[PDB]
Amino acid sequence: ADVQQKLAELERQSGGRLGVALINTADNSQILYRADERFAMCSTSKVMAAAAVLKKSESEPNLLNQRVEIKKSDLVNYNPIAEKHVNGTMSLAELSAAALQYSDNVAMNKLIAHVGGPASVTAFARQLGDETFRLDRTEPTLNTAIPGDPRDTTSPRAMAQTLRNLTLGKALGDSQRAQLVTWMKGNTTGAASIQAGLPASWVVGDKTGSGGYGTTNDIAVIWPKDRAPLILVTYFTQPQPKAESRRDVLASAAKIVTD
Numbered sequence: 001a002d003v004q005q006k007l008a009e010l011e012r013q014s015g016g017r018l019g020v021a022l023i024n025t026a027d028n029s030q031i032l033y034r035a036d037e038r039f040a041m042c043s044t045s046k047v048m049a050a051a052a053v054l055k056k057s058e059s060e061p062n063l064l065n066q067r068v069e070i071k072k073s074d075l076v077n078y079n080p081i082a083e084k085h086v087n088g089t090m091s092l093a094e095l096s097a098a099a100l101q102y103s104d105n106v107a108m109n110k111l112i113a114h115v116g117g118p119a120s121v122t123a124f125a126r127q128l129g130d131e132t133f134r135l136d137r138t139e140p141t142l143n144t145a146i147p148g149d150p151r152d153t154t155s156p157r158a159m160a161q162t163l164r165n166l167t168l169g170k171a172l173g174d175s176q177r178a179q180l181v182t183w184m185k186g187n188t189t190g191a192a193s194i195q196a197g198l199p200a201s202w203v204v205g206d207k208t209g210s211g212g213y214g215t216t217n218d219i220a221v222i223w224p225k226d227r228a229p230l231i232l233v234t235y236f237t238q239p240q241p242k243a244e245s246r247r248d249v250l251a252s253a254a255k256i257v258t259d
Helices: 003-014 042-057 061-065 092-102 105-115 118-127 156-167 174-185 247-258
Strands: 017-024 029-033 067-069 089-091 203-211 215-223 230-237
Touching: 003 017, 003 029, 003 247, 017 156, 017 247, 029 156, 042 061, 042 092, 042 105, 042 118, 042 156, 042 174, 042 203, 042 215, 061 092, 089 092, 092 105, 092 174, 105 118, 156 174, 156 215, 156 230, 174 203, 215 247, 230 247
Parallel strands: none
Antiparallel strands: 017 029, 017 230, 067 089, 203 215, 215 230
16 A cells, blocks of 8 residues: 555656655565665765765774865855865864765765765775665766766665664664764754654654755654664655755655555
């Protein structure tokens, strides 16, 4: 399924292409909708960049305190935090939090550069057992989200499995996993997306993304009241280049799959 039918109806009503992966860790069950198709990740890829820096810090303890200069030349399209720090430095921890909690695109680029570019982020994903994830480009061009373009895409299934590994599994050390979960729980950008489709009492750590073709994304680790945690990936993209974002569609998907 009944849930499948409802997701299909939502997708049809919405006029776009919807990809959903829910992992219920209570019974290791999955709800999948277009879960093996590729979707542009947009800013949801920031989780993998931050995770790659956190993994690095397991062998370089002082790494998150390392200072990175922010210059005017670094500014891109959306720099809500970095623009306050031009001509100064931010720590890698501060950059990670900015990327994850405010979707700062300078912060993302600094994380990408630190670990050695998009192919290094991708190689990190491969190390985790994710052979689907691919980060090709830096900010801001990784958000073009052109249909049929595999650059900077992943599938809902792969991203849910990987997100499970990062936040609930052992991909990262204890301290690094906690830090990632803490950052994602402090996200400021997700209240209208998956969270808006869940009960108020549930706890969510998520990363949103949006981009060209009205791409509207959210990936979340969810702690329902008195239940085992869930992983939910909701990817949505639309046919028209200038389509508007549809965060409501992600909230609706979230409600359908958690009902």
